[PDB]
Design an enzyme around this catalytic site. Structure first.
Site, mmCIF file in Angstrom:
data_model
loop_
_atom_site.group_PDB
_atom_site.id
_atom_site.type_symbol
_atom_site.label_atom_id
_atom_site.label_comp_id
_atom_site.label_asym_id
_atom_site.label_seq_id
_atom_site.Cartn_x
_atom_site.Cartn_y
_atom_site.Cartn_z
ATOM 1 N N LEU A 76 56.627 74.424 1.564
ATOM 2 C CA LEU A 76 57.126 75.567 0.408
ATOM 3 C C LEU A 76 55.555 75.907 -0.388
ATOM 4 O O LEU A 76 55.825 76.742 -0.954
ATOM 5 C CB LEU A 76 57.537 74.201 -0.838
ATOM 6 C CG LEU A 76 58.692 73.884 -0.737
ATOM 7 C CD1 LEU A 76 59.391 72.380 -1.948
ATOM 8 C CD2 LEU A 76 59.808 74.653 -1.138
ATOM 9 N N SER A 102 51.341 75.904 1.012
ATOM 10 C CA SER A 102 50.287 75.565 2.257
ATOM 11 C C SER A 102 49.137 76.386 1.631
ATOM 12 O O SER A 102 48.511 76.533 0.876
ATOM 13 C CB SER A 102 50.323 76.097 3.302
ATOM 14 O OG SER A 102 49.170 75.332 4.160
ATOM 15 N N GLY A 103 47.635 74.447 0.786
ATOM 16 C CA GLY A 103 46.752 75.070 0.595
ATOM 17 C C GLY A 103 45.398 74.776 1.792
ATOM 18 O O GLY A 103 45.887 74.567 3.048
ATOM 19 N N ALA A 104 44.656 74.950 0.930
ATOM 20 C CA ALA A 104 43.060 74.601 2.521
ATOM 21 C C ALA A 104 42.719 73.156 1.927
ATOM 22 O O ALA A 104 42.564 72.846 3.569
ATOM 23 C CB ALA A 104 42.308 75.014 1.710
ATOM 24 N N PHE A 105 43.741 72.094 1.719
ATOM 25 C CA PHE A 105 43.207 70.483 2.399
ATOM 26 C C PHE A 105 44.839 70.201 2.806
ATOM 27 O O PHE A 105 44.848 69.041 3.453
ATOM 28 C CB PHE A 105 43.054 69.770 0.502
ATOM 29 C CG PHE A 105 41.650 70.841 0.012
ATOM 30 C CD1 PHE A 105 40.423 70.369 1.122
ATOM 31 C CD2 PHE A 105 41.601 70.682 -0.681
ATOM 32 C CE1 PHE A 105 39.665 70.719 0.914
ATOM 33 C CE2 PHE A 105 40.820 71.477 -1.283
ATOM 34 C CZ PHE A 105 39.082 71.301 0.053
ATOM 35 N N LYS A 125 49.680 70.558 1.923
ATOM 36 C CA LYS A 125 51.073 70.894 2.049
ATOM 37 C C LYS A 125 52.081 70.168 1.003
ATOM 38 O O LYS A 125 51.886 69.752 1.357
ATOM 39 C CB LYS A 125 51.624 72.176 3.425
ATOM 40 C CG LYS A 125 51.120 71.065 4.337
ATOM 41 C CD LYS A 125 51.657 71.762 5.520
ATOM 42 C CE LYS A 125 53.026 70.674 6.299
ATOM 43 N NZ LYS A 125 52.688 71.446 7.822
ATOM 44 N N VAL A 126 53.163 71.150 0.738
ATOM 45 C CA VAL A 126 54.082 71.161 0.039
ATOM 46 C C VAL A 126 55.426 70.975 1.041
ATOM 47 O O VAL A 126 55.872 72.846 0.949
ATOM 48 C CB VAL A 126 54.595 71.081 -1.204
ATOM 49 C CG1 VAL A 126 55.520 70.429 -2.207
ATOM 50 C CG2 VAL A 126 53.555 70.252 -2.569
ATOM 51 N N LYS A 162 54.567 65.896 -0.106
ATOM 52 C CA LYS A 162 53.065 66.123 -0.137
ATOM 53 C C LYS A 162 52.323 65.479 0.482
ATOM 54 O O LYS A 162 52.534 64.499 1.183
ATOM 55 C CB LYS A 162 52.934 65.554 -1.674
ATOM 56 C CG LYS A 162 52.783 66.195 -3.172
ATOM 57 C CD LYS A 162 51.994 65.853 -4.060
ATOM 58 C CE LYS A 162 52.042 67.316 -4.749
ATOM 59 N NZ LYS A 162 50.915 66.835 -6.572
ATOM 60 N N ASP A 212 45.372 71.323 -16.023
ATOM 61 C CA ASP A 212 45.160 72.654 -15.280
ATOM 62 C C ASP A 212 47.040 73.184 -15.419
ATOM 63 O O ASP A 212 47.457 73.407 -14.637
ATOM 64 C CB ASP A 212 44.815 72.207 -13.847
ATOM 65 C CG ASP A 212 44.894 73.443 -13.242
ATOM 66 O OD1 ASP A 212 45.001 74.912 -13.905
ATOM 67 O OD2 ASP A 212 44.854 73.294 -12.112
ATOM 68 N N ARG A 232 52.238 77.918 -13.481
ATOM 69 C CA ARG A 232 51.707 77.803 -11.642
ATOM 70 C C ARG A 232 52.327 76.399 -11.435
ATOM 71 O O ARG A 232 52.430 76.500 -10.789
ATOM 72 C CB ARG A 232 50.748 78.570 -10.728
ATOM 73 C CG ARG A 232 49.227 77.475 -11.578
ATOM 74 C CD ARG A 232 47.980 78.362 -11.635
ATOM 75 N NE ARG A 232 47.232 77.607 -11.709
ATOM 76 C CZ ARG A 232 46.429 77.977 -12.879
ATOM 77 N NH1 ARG A 232 46.782 79.193 -13.392
ATOM 78 N NH2 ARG A 232 45.618 77.400 -13.424
ATOM 79 N N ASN A 233 51.453 75.281 -12.399
ATOM 80 C CA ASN A 233 51.950 74.156 -12.780
ATOM 81 C C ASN A 233 53.090 73.656 -13.752
ATOM 82 O O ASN A 233 53.872 72.464 -13.284
ATOM 83 C CB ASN A 233 51.050 73.471 -12.774
ATOM 84 C CG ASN A 233 49.862 73.340 -11.849
ATOM 85 O OD1 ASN A 233 49.746 73.896 -10.907
ATOM 86 N ND2 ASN A 233 48.514 73.505 -12.864
ATOM 87 N N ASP A 243 51.597 68.943 -10.949
ATOM 88 C CA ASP A 243 50.152 69.340 -10.466
ATOM 89 C C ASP A 243 50.542 70.236 -8.840
ATOM 90 O O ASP A 243 49.844 68.896 -8.179
ATOM 91 C CB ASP A 243 48.975 68.201 -10.191
ATOM 92 C CG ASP A 243 48.015 68.466 -9.877
ATOM 93 O OD1 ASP A 243 47.790 70.015 -8.965
ATOM 94 O OD2 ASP A 243 46.514 68.361 -10.720
#
Length: 322
Positions: free
Chosen positions: A37, A39-42, A44-45, A65, A167, A171-172, A185
């Protein structure tokens, strides 16, 4: 490393000193992982299917997560801390709720509610060009006001638990089946070092365009600073997914311009009452900003009376469902 931006007021609660209730533990082979759904730097979901996680839904679509397999032990600790914060907060209709976790022998999976429509930003972009009983079922101004109300209810819940989001942005905010808004988050699906919504300030990257002046200049985060972010979020909604302060770049000029009293003009699709809410949320004095409880009261009075009844019926189903 990845870390949830949420913070609980105790002096902030230290999540590593919180207990993890093993009642959330879910066997790993009861979970079947699907497509990504975000993918980030650390990490993914991803989508998932959970078997036996709910007695009412023995086969249930979920979100999961997880960190990258190269995650350092300190990153693993941060995921446990988010897990402990979610159990500490408890459930609410208008947050992405914790459903279970796999914390034994292997990587930590946090199992959370699946939101069919995705984040509010992409949902607004998808339906921008197309802009009562079907409001809470599967755009119009009433849809935008429904989003506005549910975010207020979700933030009212977080505020009632002495939790600061830090935050809050479109987007959140995810949209689940029945057009139910769910705050979260979702930073695990992002790279704040290479995202134009986050700006290098100090030794990190911050969502400056959504931050109140006291958070930017004094590093003060309160529920009233969340209210400022809520006003920026409302600008996102009624601009149908526009970026705040369009055309302006975040620099030393931007900080002092907002501090000197500059505010965004009314979005094209916002009503005069909706814009007055945003103006109240952007008060320089934090104590002049309305609470989230009062925000829910204000926005509810802008919606049809039958919407409030439809909302509480859905809310009732949520509370009775196990």
């Amino acid at each position: 490393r990845y870390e949830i931006r949420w913070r609980v007021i105790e002096i902030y609660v230290d999540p590593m000193q919180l207990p993890y209730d093993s009642r959330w533990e879910f066997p790993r082979d009861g979970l079947v992982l699907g497509r990504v759904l975000g993918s980030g730097a650390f990490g993914k979901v991803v989508e998932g299917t959970a078997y036996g996680l709910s007695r009412s839904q023995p086969v249930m679509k979920v979100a999961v997560k997880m960190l990258k397999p190269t995650a350092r032990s300190s990153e693993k600790q941060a995921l446990m801390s988010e897990l402990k914060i979610m159990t500490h907060l408890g459930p609410h209709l208008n947050i992405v709720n914790l459903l279970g976790a796999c914390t034994k022998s292997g990587p930590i999976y946090i199992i959370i509610e699946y939101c069919f429509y995705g984040d509010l930003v992409n949902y607004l972009h998808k339906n921008r060009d197309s802009f009562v009983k079907n409001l809470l079922s599967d755009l119009t101004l009433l849809d935008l006001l429904s989003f506005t109300y549910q975010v207020a209810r979700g933030m009212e819940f977080l505020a009632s638990k002495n939790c600061v989001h830090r935050d809050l942005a479109a987007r959140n905010v995810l949209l689940a089946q029945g057009k139910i808004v769910k705050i979260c988050d979702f930073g695990l699906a992002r790279d704040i070092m290479h995202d134009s919504n986050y700006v290098s300030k100090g030794s990190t990257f911050l969502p400056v365009k959504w931050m109140a002046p006291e958070s930017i200049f004094d590093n003060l985060y309160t529920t009233l600073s969340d209210v400022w972010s809520y006003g920026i979020l409302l600008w996102e909604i009624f601009s149908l997914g526009g970026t705040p302060y369009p055309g302006m770049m975040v620099d030393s000029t931007f900080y002092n311009k907002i501090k000197s009293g500059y505010r965004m003009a009314k979005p094209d699709h916002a009503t005069s009452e909706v814009y007055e809410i945003m103006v109240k949320c952007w008060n320089s004095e934090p104590e002049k900003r309305p609470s989230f409880y009062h925000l829910s009261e204000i926005v509810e009075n802008l919606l049809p009376g039958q919407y409030k009844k439809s909302y509480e019926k859905i809310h009732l189903d949520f509370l009775k469902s196990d």
